[PDB]
Amino acid sequence: SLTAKDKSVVKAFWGKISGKADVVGAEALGRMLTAYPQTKTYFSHWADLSPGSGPVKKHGGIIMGAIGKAVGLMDDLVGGMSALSDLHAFKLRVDPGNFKILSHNILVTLAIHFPSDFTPEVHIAVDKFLAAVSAALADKYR
Amino acid sequence: SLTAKDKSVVKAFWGKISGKADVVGAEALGRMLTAYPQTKTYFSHWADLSPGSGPVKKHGGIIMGAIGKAVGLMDDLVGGMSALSDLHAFKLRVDPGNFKILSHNILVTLAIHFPSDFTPEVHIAVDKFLAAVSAALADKYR
Amino acid sequence: VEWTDAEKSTISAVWGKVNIDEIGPLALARVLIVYPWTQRYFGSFGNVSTPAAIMGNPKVAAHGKVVCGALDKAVKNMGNILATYKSLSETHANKLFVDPDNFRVLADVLTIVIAAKFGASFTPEIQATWQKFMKVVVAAMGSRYF
Amino acid sequence: VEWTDAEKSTISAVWGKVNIDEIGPLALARVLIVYPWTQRYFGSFGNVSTPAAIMGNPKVAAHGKVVCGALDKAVKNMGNILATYKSLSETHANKLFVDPDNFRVLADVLTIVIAAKFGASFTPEIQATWQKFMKVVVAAMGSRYF
Ligand code: HEM
Ligand code: HEM
Ligand code: HEM
Ligand code: HEM
């Protein structure tokens, strides 16, 4: 339940991180698979699941672009993310407890790349935003 | 994210339980403090914290009358329970993990009292509503 | 944990009025219906297509009974549940990769189901020790999760 | 659990670049800022009223270093962590009544601070054994909740 202030900080922080979004994405996914191995069952059709692999790289940018588009849909995230909630609920059947894991690794990747920028006040808003993207993705499950 | 199906099942069932509401609230509260003792610190100014005590009874009906009202506010709950969010957020500052505890105990008491009516399909919709009431209440925390 | 002798009889006594051939199925079926993402762990089960289809499925029923069989030895062994549940924790962790949050979801659903069956004889104080026991079980299940 | 010799060395190698006096106060302060309900547990600390207030608080500073010394004993004693932490677990549960989910929130914020501190040398791999150590700790802390 993102406020006006939460929205300003995400849009601005989002602007400085924009440029490295592929790098952030690919690294954030590779870390999820590497430190949280229960998530590996969902990507078994891939040739490599090692950090920096080709499929890891490419899917990482995909995830970051979707987050990017969520940025502009901040006023209605369940509406905006409906199709992706179905894909993950029914087609992929991803247990919704994995959304938290993906979000924690994205914050870890941000702290590693923008330490001075990732302040406690930037962390609150990004955390809230990421929790809200998650909730929108887990909305069509039941 | 309550569907049209979900609100109808909620309202229908609510019609069935309405009459016993003060008993269900009272009983669910008494179960929470007795089965989950970490909730007890919030109610220290109360004389008796045991199942069936006076204040335990009186407060349990206060809770069911609040939930009874959320039944009518199902199109906008975060908006509908704003004032209750503040109270629990800043006046009482309740650890929000206790919202799931109360919610489980209300489900345990509905089954005790309406075992025939408390069908799996009634369970999906009351669970969803109760979770949605918990998420509206935790809105003003940060 | 320390189990009092009164704790332990209370448990055997509640489990005593429990029939696995009926409770087992009620709880696993209620779980796949209220938390539908759990269906994905059970691939070979059949027509889980509707609640009715879940509710009358015989593979579902069979597993529900298997599950209450493991709980049976917990009751029988309240002092070695960790000992007793090591490879169960290992298959679920390493073989099936079950998110451990789901052990919790199952325990709460078995409780609603027992509640519904015992009515008002399922009291706060019985509930209170049933809970202690349920979290001792849940802990044993997530013990080989590393 | 089973720790390999290389695993153990990775941990004491990670813990070795960490300065309790720096990371202690950073992590606990962040925990009180990002998950503000955690503040109600810390009664005497004072003016927590703002992030600036929280960040400049010395009672907070100091408890952050208290928490890090407890973690140091786990690093020193990677074998008896369950034994090491029985009394800590008992106090958080029966004296303090801390909802046990807060242990994972804390573990996650400490990890973000170390990452921002270590930068690129905090690798996926390292993160991976750092993460196995944090779940053991979280296990040990929530061990006497019954
Ligand atoms: C906020 C979180 C997430 C976002 C924004 C997101 C976004 C996406 C997007 C945009 C796609 C591509 C779909 C297409 O081709 O139309 C996708 C696919 C997929 N997602 Fe996610 N996802 C998220 C979380 C997760 C998590 C946590 C998991 C598993 C742990 C997961 C598993 C998958 C899989 C297995 C695919 C298909 C991969 C492929 O293209 O081969 N997703 N997701
Ligand atoms: C959805 C769940 C809940 C609802 C609908 C609810 C509702 C209420 C209401 C309507 C009041 C009275 C406020 C007034 O008079 O304006 C109240 C007070 C209070 N609530 Fe809650 N509550 C919930 C959950 C909880 C939980 C989980 C706890 C503790 C863990 C809690 C602790 C308190 C306390 C300590 C008070 C003070 C009331 C008194 O003693 O007079 N509440 N709540
Ligand atoms: C109360 C906690 C639980 C207990 C005591 C329990 C017990 C058991 C037992 C005794 C088995 C026998 C399998 C073998 O011997 O290899 C089993 C298998 C299995 N369990 Fe659990 N279980 C629990 C919770 C869960 C949950 C919540 C899930 C997933 C949502 C799950 C998923 C599975 C699966 C997929 C199998 C394999 C059976 C098959 O696919 O044929 N379990 N469980
Ligand atoms: C990360 C795991 C944690 C560890 C290792 C830890 C360690 C400690 C230690 C060593 C003490 C000193 C007490 C004594 O020796 O008597 C303490 C006290 C305390 N802890 Fe924790 N703690 C952890 C997590 C938490 C969390 C997440 C919270 C609440 C959100 C919390 C709340 C408290 C409080 C309120 C005190 C009392 C101290 C005072 O008021 O002076 N702890 N903890």
Instruction: Compute how many other C-beta atoms are within 10 angstroms of the C-beta atom of residue C75.
Output: 17
Query: Which two structure tokens, joined as six digits, stand for C26?
Result: 């009620």
Question: How far is CA D112 from each of CA A61, A98, D119, D122, rounded to the nearest angstrom?
Answer: 22, 18, 10, 10
Q: How many whole angstroms from D3 Cα to the centroid of ligand 1?
A: 33
Token pair 């202030």 is found at A5
CA distance A115 to A119: 8
Q: Which of A38, A84, A127, A133 to mutate to test the pocket of ligand 1 (most atoms within 8 A of CB)?
A: A84
Answer whether A124 sits within 8 Å of D34, measured CB to CB: yes
- In short, whether B111's Cβ falls inside 6 Å of ligand 2 is no
Question: How far is CA B15 from each of CA A6, A31, B71, B115, rounded to the nearest angstrom?
Answer: 40, 50, 10, 16
CA distance B11 to C14: 34
* Cross-chain CB nearest to A1 (options B124, B128, B139): B139
Q: How many whole angstroms from B12 Cα to the centroid of ligand 3?
A: 35
Answer whether A120 sits within 8 Å of D29, measured CB to CB: yes
Residue owning the nearest CA to atom 43 of ligand 4: D67
Q: How many whole angstroms from A60 Cα to the centroid of ligand 1?
A: 9
Scored b (16 or more CB within 10 A) or e, A21-55 reads: bebbbbbbbbbbbbbbbbbeebeeeeeebebebee
Structural domains of chain B, with CATH: 1-142 (1.10.490.10)
Scored b (16 or more CB within 10 A) or e, B103-126 reads: bbbbbbbbbbbbbeebbbebbbbb
DSSP D88-142: HHHIIIIIS---TTHHHHHHHHHHHHHHHHHGGGS-HHHHHHHHHHHHHHHHHHT
- In short, whether B36's Cβ falls inside 6 Å of ligand 2 is no
DSSP state of A88: I
DSSP state of D47: -
Resolution (A): 2.5
Asked if residue A33 lies in contact with residue A49, where contact means CB atoms within 8 angstroms, the answer is yes
Question: How far is CA B75 from each of CA B7, B71, B131, rounded to the nearest angstrom?
Answer: 9, 9, 15
Identity of the residue numbered C97 = F
Q: Check CB contact of A35 with chain D, cutoff 8 Å.
A: yes
Answer whether B95 sits within 8 Å of D39, measured CB to CB: no
> Among residues A103, A99, A137, A93, which one has the least CA distance to residue A123?
A103
Asked if residue C25 lies in contact with residue C59, where contact means CB atoms within 8 angstroms, the answer is no
What DSSP element (H or E) covers D73? helix D58-76
Asked if residue A29 lies in contact with residue A63, where contact means CB atoms within 8 angstroms, the answer is yes
Identity of the residue numbered D45 = F
Identity of the residue numbered B19 = G
CATH superfamily of the domain spanning D1-146: Globins (1.10.490.10)
Asked if residue A41 lies in contact with residue A85, where contact means CB atoms within 8 angstroms, the answer is no
Give domain limits for chain D: 1-146
CA B134 to ligand 2: nearest atom: 1
Asked if residue D64 lies in contact with residue D24, where contact means CB atoms within 8 angstroms, the answer is yes
Asked if residue C106 lies in contact with residue C68, where contact means CB atoms within 8 angstroms, the answer is no
Instruction: Compute how many other C-beta atoms are within 10 angstroms of the C-beta atom of residue D67.
Output: 19
Query: Which two structure tokens, joined as six digits, stand for D38?
Result: 């955690």
